[PDB]
């Protein structure tokens, strides 16, 4: 019938795309990075420990000034930290205690949070009245909020557990654009450095590259074997990395349009929950459910270091814009800043 | 003290005043007991939460606060979420207990409930959370087994080889067929409960009618036992 013919045509297109991708695989990344010096052993020591939250820390986001930070914990609280002095600048109670995401506006005036309430709440930090006040509530999604990322003071992209991303207009509170490609819960999204594209990984072992200005998927990358929990853009914006339930991270390229390197080991059998790149883009920081964090050489795929300082599963991981420190949160209600030693 | 400016000390004072309110919030956080309500379309959990919040005073999560013997329970019922529970059931990994409602009078969808219970029991993050198992619609089950063409043997073949134990202790006036069916259904869940428990994990199976008043007391007693075993575990007693 019609459905069978359409399915056969889809399989033919899959074969064509696979052959086109295979034709351009001149050599592997590991062969190209086979004479450079290994990174060594990245020994990172803890500098600050922040001990405010009472329950599982589910997300965090650094400030663009590289000094302030935000953190959400499922007791229903959102705390802004001064990392240098471990002071508490703001402590915001939330209407719903089931929060899965955080954001810090690049301007610094607003914060955002969402979760099992299917609503993204935007709070205005710099109020003439001396408070922190709920600026807006965006209530379009029909599933839990997994991630959110500011574009400017009036734009934000959200991903929900209903196979949908959305670009909003904060002033009007209405969805400007909707991205409806995934077939599983979208778990994360990372904005491009120029904020003209982004990527979304979902619970179907596929990542998709969306165009914010026109709202259509550009490319799809399917290399993983299980649900993807994390994603992050390469510093130059021409690649990204993904972590999934299988104990493998993967590096994908947007120009070659295929996977480049796999970061895995036999001893690791848990799932990755958070990935990030260093400022130069050579270290991949992956948080695991074995209470640890692994510093991989993004080239050569060698494992360079371990950040073992948490008593429970690591949920959120971020890197300072200066590239000076790494903030790791965990389910033991503690958040730790890590820095190198000369 | 020294090397701190005039504003750099007022910042510390504001941080300490924030910690004061955090310490006050910790107390009210510790006082209440958080429960997770779970069920299916035909469970009847809506009826029990309505009739239990009334007498014991498109959102993604519904909250119900009640109080028994001056202790506070906060129960969470999921709603307006989708059909895949892999990634939102990890939020409720530190709740006091999982209330699980099963429609007993539905033989067609009883293995579905059994598989749901198995997946909940064996989950890595819910591996240490006790379950209060309510088996609703005992009246409908009673009239279903008392006389009719429906038989439990067509779906569970081992019912015909099942006899109620010596220590049955049935409710007065119950037909032996009804009570045999009741303990067969309860054993179907207790088998899974005891197959992989290994401590820190206990199922509490109850038989609930449509409108039963003593449903808050059942949960109160079950939570008492749960917390008591936590205290015993922390002291290496049992």
């Amino acid at each position: 019938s019609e459905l069978d013919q359409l399915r056969q045509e889809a399989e033919q297109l899959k074969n064509q795309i696979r052959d086109a991708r295979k034709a351009c695989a001149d050599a592997t990344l590991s062969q190209i990075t086979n004479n450079i010096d290994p990174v060594g052993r990245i020994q990172m020591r803890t500098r600050r420990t922040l001990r405010g939250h009472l329950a599982k820390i589910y997300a965090m986001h650094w400030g663009t000034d590289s000094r302030l930070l935000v953190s959400a914990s499922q007791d229903g609280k959102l705390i802004i930290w001064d990392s240098y002095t471990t002071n508490k600048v703001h402590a915001i109670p939330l209407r719903s205690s089931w929060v899965m995401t955080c954001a810090y506006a690049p301007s610094g005036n607003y914060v955002a949070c969402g979760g099992l309430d299917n609503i993204c709440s935007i709070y205005n930090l710099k109020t003439r009245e001396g408070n922190v006040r709920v600026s807006r509530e965006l209530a379009g999604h029909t599933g839990y909020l997994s991630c959110c990322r500011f574009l400017d003071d009036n734009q934000i992209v959200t991903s929900s557990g209903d196979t949908t991303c959305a670009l909003w207009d904060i002033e009007t509170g209405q969805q400007t654009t909707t991205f409806t490609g995934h077939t599983g819960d979208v778990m994360s999204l990372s904005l491009a450095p120029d904020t003209r594209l982004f990527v979304s990984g979902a619970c179907d072992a596929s990542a998709k590259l969306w165009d914010v200005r026109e709202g259509m998927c550009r490319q799809t990358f399917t290399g993983h074997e299980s649900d993807i929990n994390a994603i992050c853009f390469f510093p130059n914006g021409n690649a990204f990395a993904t972590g999934s339930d299988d104990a493998t991270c993967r590096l994908f390229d947007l120009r070659a349009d295929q996977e480049l390197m796999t970061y895995s080991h036999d001893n690791i059998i848990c799932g990755i929950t958070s990935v990030s790149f260093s400022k130069s883009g050579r270290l991949l920081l992956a948080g695991y459910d074995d209470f640890n964090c692994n510093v991989w050489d993004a080239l050569k795929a060698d494992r360079a270091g371990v950040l073992a300082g948490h008593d429970n599963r690591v949920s959120c991981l971020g890197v300072t814009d200066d590239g000076m420190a790494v903030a790791t949160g965990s389910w033991d209600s503690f958040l730790k800043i890590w820095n190198g030693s000369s | 003290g020294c090397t701190l400016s005039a504003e750099d000390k007022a910042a510390v004072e504001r941080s300490k005043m924030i910690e004061k309110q955090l310490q006050k919030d910790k107390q009210v956080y510790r006082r209440t007991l958080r429960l997770l309500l779970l069920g299916a379309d035909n469970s009847g959990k809506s009826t029990i939460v309505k009739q239990m919040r009334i007498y014991h005073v498109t959102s993604g999560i519904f909250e119900t606060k009640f109080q028994v013997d001056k202790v506070n329970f906060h129960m969470f019922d999921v709603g307006a979420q989708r059909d895949e529970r892999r990634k939102w059931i990890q939020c409720f990994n530190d709740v006091t207990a999982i209330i699980f409602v099963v429609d007993s009078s539905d033989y067609n969808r009883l293995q579905e409930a059994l598989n749901d219970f198995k997946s909940i029991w064996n989950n890595r993050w819910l591996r240490t959370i006790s379950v209060i198992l309510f088996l609703n619609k005992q009246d409908l089950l009673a009239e279903k087994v008392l006389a009719g063409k429906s038989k439990i043997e067509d779906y569970f073949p081992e019912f015909a080889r099942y006899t109620t134990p010596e220590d049955a202790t049935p409710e007065p006036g119950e037909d032996p067929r009804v009570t045999r069916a009741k303990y067969f259904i309860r054993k179907e869940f207790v088998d899974i409960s005891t197959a992989s428990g290994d401590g820190r994990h206990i199922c509490y199976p109850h038989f609930t009618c449509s409108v039963d008043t003593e449903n808050a007391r059942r949960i109160f007693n079950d939570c008492k036992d749960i917390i008591l075993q936590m205290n015993l575990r922390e002291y290496n007693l049992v």
Partner: nanobody
Amino acid sequence: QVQLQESGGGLVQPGGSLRLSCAASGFTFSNYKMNWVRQAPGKGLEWVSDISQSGASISYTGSVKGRFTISRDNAKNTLYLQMNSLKPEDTAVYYCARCPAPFTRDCFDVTSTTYAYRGQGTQVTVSS
């Protein structure tokens, strides 16, 4: 990449026999517990059989216990279902499903609609 392609299954008389096969690709077959599920005509998805990674633990749905047998070939990457003594209520679309994560006992969302890791299904019609 992840693909579970089922084969076998067609018109058969009551009391007959059939062998459903499921070829798996795109993942490591030996690290996942695997299931056979079923959708009856005008009915919801129903879980039929289950087999662990090694195959030591094998489970059925009771209504078909004793007549169905689930098998696992980890070297050929295949999942088999032998159906014996079929009944007019055994006609349905059969799906070969994979649990979302490796090295786990629990298997969430296997019988859900629009589940990611599941085959397109084979139709079985037990009609005279």
